[PDB]
């Protein structure tokens, strides 16, 4: 994992699953063509995006109904740090460098 990040599902029906962040934009949502397919009715078809620009990893809500949280705090966009918890619907994902 050179310059890449990892998302590990800590809470949700697929707890233990790992998603690699290494592309410029990584889509997260209920659409089956999502890069990170999060299959729960609480997740919107198009929900969030993990954007990698330069060195920083950012989470961005793209118009979901239930929003996106970073460490129990609602955000429109937030720069992610090692060990941060991202909530997308009922799913809880840990961000790791």
């Amino acid at each position: 994992p050179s310059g890449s990040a990892l998302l590990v599902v800590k809470r949700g029906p697929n707890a233990g699953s790992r998603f690699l962040l290494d592309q410029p934009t990584t889509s997260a949502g209920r659409h089956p063509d999502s890069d990170i397919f999060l299959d729960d009715v609480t997740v919107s078809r198009r929900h969030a995006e993990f954007r990698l620009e330069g060195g920083e990893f950012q989470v961005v809500d793209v118009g979901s109904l239930n929003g996106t949280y970073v460490n129990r705090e609602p955000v429109d966009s937030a720069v992610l740090a090692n060990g941060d918890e991202v909530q997308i619907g009922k799913f809880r994902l840990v961000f790791l460098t």
């Binding site: 809470r11 949700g12 029906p13 209920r30 659409h31 299959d39 729960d40 009715v41 609480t42 919107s44 078809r45 198009r46 118009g63 979901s64 109904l65 239930n66 929003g67 609602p74 619907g89 009922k90």
Partner: protein, 824 residues
Amino acid sequence: DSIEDKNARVIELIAAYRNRGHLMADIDPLRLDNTRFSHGLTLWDLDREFKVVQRKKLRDILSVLRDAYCRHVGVEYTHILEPEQQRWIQERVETKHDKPTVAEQKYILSKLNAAEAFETFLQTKYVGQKRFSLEGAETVIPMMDAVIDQCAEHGLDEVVIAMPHRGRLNVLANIVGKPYSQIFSEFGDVKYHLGATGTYIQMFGDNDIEVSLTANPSHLEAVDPVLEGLVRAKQDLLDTGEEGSDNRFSVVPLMLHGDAAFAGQGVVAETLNLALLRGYRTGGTIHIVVNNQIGFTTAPTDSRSSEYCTDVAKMIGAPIFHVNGDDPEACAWVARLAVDFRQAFKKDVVIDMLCYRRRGHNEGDDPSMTQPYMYDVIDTKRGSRKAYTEALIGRGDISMKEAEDALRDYQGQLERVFNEVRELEKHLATAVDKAMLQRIGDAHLALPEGFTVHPRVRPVLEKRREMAYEGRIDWAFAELLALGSLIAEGKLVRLSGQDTQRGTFTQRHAVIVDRKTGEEFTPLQLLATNPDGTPTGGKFLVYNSALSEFAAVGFEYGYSVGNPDAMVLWEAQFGDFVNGAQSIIDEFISSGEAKWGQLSDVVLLLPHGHEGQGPDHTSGRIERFLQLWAEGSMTIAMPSTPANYFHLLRRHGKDGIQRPLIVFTPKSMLRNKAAVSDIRDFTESKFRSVLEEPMYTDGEGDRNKVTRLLLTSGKIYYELAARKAKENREDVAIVRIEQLAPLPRRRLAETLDRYPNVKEKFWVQEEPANQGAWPSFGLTLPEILPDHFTGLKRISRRAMSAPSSGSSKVHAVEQQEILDTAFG
């Protein structure tokens, strides 16, 4: 009118809102009743202060009272006898409420999106789904979600749901969390009757909770006592509730109903009646009535004799909240309050969700044929999801962009279900040692220090210790020997029925009562502890039931489903009253395995036998259980000896098979001196489905002398044997069929082959010709074994429309006629 008069009028006005404000609350989303919406005070008193301890203006008292009792929630609580329960409700209902956060409102809207997209898909994709439509009642989904979330907020272990068919697949997808690939695997269906389990995760909290759905027939409300038994077995396993080390009752029953069935079905009142009983309580049930103000084509005025469909819940002083189904925030708020009440007081709460049924009852039904006014009003109603989205915009709670996000989310859910299903379409020994028998005998005399035994009970205790060591073990002790040894082996044994602790025929004495202090002692509970003091893991849970058959049998069936490892026995006072539980027998016990794959090991003990005590004290209707039977559905027996009953029970509890057992048990045969067993029959034998006379197996009897074979079952064997001994008739043998179903074809054939000189074979029974085993045996035995039973004849009472004559004199004449025919 002075200040004193004005003060009195304010206090009475406060009491009127608390008591009867619910009668004026805006609970009906259809507003069908136009005429729906103390007076010593006027406009001049609005700004006058009154003692409430603070002084408050009348206008402030009125706004609090109106908001609490006359908006979208009708509160009924002043009928509650416990003042602490009235205060608890009053304080939570009269306080200023904190508006939900935007995130909570958006989450409720996300649940309306999920419920409506599911309904839209269901009604568009398939024909014949109109009868299960949740359209007009979608708010039940955020309501149930709030119940389960509030249970998770209390850190509870599981929520178990029972419900009728309406919206069941919507509940599977949006509450239980089952995927569409499992829900839409076939093409109403068995899917509306099956059980399911899932995991609920809190959206805003840190906990998870298990969510399950029990199986049920189409018989509305029949599952209600089954759910309670299932929950109670799960609570006993988790060491929670009545038989647990904590008072959390951490398995919650969530019971759904329809408005017409909730008022009309007697099993509802029978199940409510169980709510605080020691043997049956589950710490309070959360009820939801989907009150669509219709029952197929029937108006509520033809379905009930009271203001509300939930009025039967006043039978147990439960609080009742009538809530407007078009207000999902009030619906979710009432759900959370219901769970908090249930946790604080361990008592049922009833939620009356007022809603409507958008469609006709089924396909081809235009409901305006019988309810034109209701359906002209429904045709103008906008959906719950659109109305709530519009309410949120108008209130400024959400922006137009956020409302667009919600519509986007909705269309995405609609696309998801339509596309997923599219792709799915194109793709052991029963014998114990002498030491075990002696220990169970000894336990009856191992009384607590200073215990005073009733003088009539003392000989029973002493006779049991005597039987354990010397033999001549009677039926009542053999039963306790079987249950006691299972407990010593670590099994949980639950035994209940009407007066079952003492026994109807004063024969059991499973619980004994101190003559001076009323203190109870349970001798078999001592077998839950090994001689070294370590627990065996076993337990004896023995209770006196309520005077119910339907709810009591339903509870025991559910209990056995909830814990397949428990030994569960229900006992009828007399088998003649079990027809009161016919719906449970037909819909769950005899058929649940074949219909739903749901297994039960429940035992039914049915006192049976012709003794001249009338048509309601003679028969358990053997013929009806035999008719219900099909290969592998149930085991049906009528043992004639204490030891064979012992082996039957031990086999049932130890075979590792989940299959109901029906036992036709004795009454006078409990004290028949010939119906006793030897120690050896418990230590050196097993269950015998077919028995011979002890003169052929143990004595000097000659089977080659036999020319007439009498086949029978039950207590008549002893009378047949007494006549045989008195008349010294070596030419006649008596064979007993102990296991009535499955017919023991192989053992029967082997037994009959030991009598090579039989010229004539008769089936002998006490029951009328159209009753007992003859209607099935008479037809099946010649077909199944033609070399043994072609020519088999019947000896019985004449065919009757009742199980017996009402006259004990006629009984005696008929009984003597059967013996005289058998040896004629």
